[PDB]
Design a protein around this ligand. Structure first.
Ligand SMILES: CS(=O)(=O)c1cccc2[nH]c3c(c12)CCCc1ccc(CN2CC[C@](O)(c4ccccc4)C2)cc1-3
Ligand SMILES: CS(=O)(=O)c1cccc2[nH]c3c(c12)CCCc1ccc(CN2CC[C@](O)(c4ccccc4)C2)cc1-3
Lengths: 296, 302
């Protein structure tokens, strides 16, 4: 029970840093370029390792030079990759990421290689005794629900002191992912999902969506410059103001930095109020830096 | 790198870039996440593209350009090798990024949005060019970029040629593709000068004929000035003052014109290096470039 596992995607992010976002049909020169190991679950793993937590990543990877870069990067961070589901395909997903240096805005053109996701059968082969926390990035909901049901069955057999804590993220407004609300101790809901469901604030979203979570769960919603809110079984709304940097330069993976920081703080025995603030603190510091170097 | 026989290769000096092309349903709004329909990694750059065409035409060829060690350079090297291009003359850098460009293509319009590569990578210097043994090249083509440094490279080829008998003299070509003032000094260099339609239009010329008559005064004695003008074909003008022309060879269906100008340049160079006349080289240039326009990439231009 020493590691934090993040189940989700690993994506190669091909980053172009620009002065201003290009208008359609225009030619602009970027300030700089870099390759970054991306994907929500993989970004959270980077932040967790930088925070000093032993962590493991589970995702599908195809053998090749792109995977070689990602594995070397994962290992340079100390991310445990022994759970990677290697695929027979041969195509790793990549993204063209446009980062506006004037305000930190990040535009992603994702190339989904349609490679097979992590299955419940792949998850069934994993020894769970080594993990204290399991975080799942919403993707293939039907398969993920089974992975979540396996963790539940494991936890029924364990005393309260050795129970694996669970978190889920619902970041895309896809109807099939809304079944994931009923799973996990901690549920992260994005501003984009909340807005798509008609909610105009983190407070509106939490009060309107709490009925979907399982008994005793905490629902969390970050709302960019408005900070973040959380709602638990006591019905008390919790809030943290954001910690914006004086100059916002890169917000790519800020949501993932918030998620990992909230997870880390909660796994350390801190209260929901303290975890919300810490989430905003680390994510806010990240927004004033290119990439993840310098958060610690 | 193996024994290269004397005066056998065609060298192209210029840019190599990794083009990341993303085909999208709708142009993304700022700070949004969208899925592309299809995405492709392609080796680009004028000199780099001409090398591909030269290899496919059956000419031994080499590329000279700047690269920085890394995964981008690894992909670009593997692509050059896939096209049978000799990369032994690449100037490896200790500072900068290997050029990478991001093109967004809208499926619902056909519009192209380009986020061009940064300029952190140093160009090939006259000092880097001075270390190259020239005896293995029969032809040297220079893509105009850092003109003041390239003028010195051109002066080194001239000095080499003064001691050579007419059969062992290295033939020279230059391309002026961007309407940048500093590049215009390159007109006075080379046996063959390629001028783009874009440059000609920016200088106020409305046709290949107008451009050739108006710019011939800038080339060195005995040089041939060449200007391709898309569907209007291509023209050439030499010291005899006779305007030469070839009609275009458009394909039944146009698929892709990216690198068509580079296909024309390499084909003209190849034909001339084979002892053919300027008239025949113009026609061959239009023939191969026209065939390319009906194909995706360079496979099948044969
Ligand atoms: C976990 S978290 O830390 O809550 C967080 C998570 C994910 C994404 C996030 N974005 C932002 C934060 C944030 C919070 C702190 C940093 C910040 C500062 C300013 C703005 C708002 N800016 C961003 C360009 C902006 O939209 C703009 C538009 C037009 C002109 C100038 C700026 C107006 C957002 C964030
Ligand atoms: C050496 S050369 O062979 O003279 C040559 C050199 C450089 C560039 C060149 N372009 C074209 C030629 C050409 C020659 C004939 C073929 C052709 C047909 C149609 C159009 C017109 N354009 C306008 C959008 C276009 O119709 C398109 C459609 C679909 C995909 C991409 C472009 C295509 C140009 C050329």
């Amino acid at each position: 029970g020493s590691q934090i596992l993040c189940v989700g995607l690993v994506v190669l992010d091909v980053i172009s840093l620009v002065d201003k976002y290009p208008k359609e049909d225009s030619e602009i020169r970027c300030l700089s370029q870099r390759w970054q190991r991306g994907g929500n679950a993989s970004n959270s793993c980077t932040v967790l390792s930088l925070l000093g937590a032993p962590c493991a990543f589970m995702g599908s990877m195809a053998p090749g030079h792109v995977a070689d870069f990602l594995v070397a990067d994962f290992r340079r961070r100390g991310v445990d990759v022994s759970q990677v589901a290697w695929q027979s395909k041969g195509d790793t997903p990549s993204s063209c990421c446009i980062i506006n240096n004037s305000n930190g805005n990040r535009t992603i053109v994702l190339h989904d290689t349609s490679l097979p996701d992590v299955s419940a059968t792949d998850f069934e082969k994993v020894d769970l005794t080594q993990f204290k926390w399991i975080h799942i990035e919403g993707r293939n909901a039907s398969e993920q629900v089974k992975m979540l049901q396996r963790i539940d069955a494991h936890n029924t057999r364990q005393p309260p002191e050795q129970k694996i804590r669970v978190s889920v993220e619902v970041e895309k407004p896809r109807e099939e992912l809304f079944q994931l609300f009923g799973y996990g101790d901690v549920v992260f809901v994005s501003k984009d999902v909340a807005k798509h469901l008609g909610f105009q604030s983190a407070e509106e979203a939490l009060r309107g969506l709490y009925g979907r979570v399982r008994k005793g769960a905490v629902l969390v919603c970050a709302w960019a410059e408005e900070g973040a809110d959380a709602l638990g079984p006591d019905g008390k709304l919790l809030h943290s103001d954001a910690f914006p940097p004086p100059r916002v330069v890169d917000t790519l993976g800020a949501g993932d930095t918030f998620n990992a920081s909230v997870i880390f703080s909660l796994s350390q025995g801190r209260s929901v109020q303290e975890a919300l603030r810490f989430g905003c603190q680390v994510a806010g510091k990240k927004c004033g830096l290119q990439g993840f170097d310098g958060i610690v």
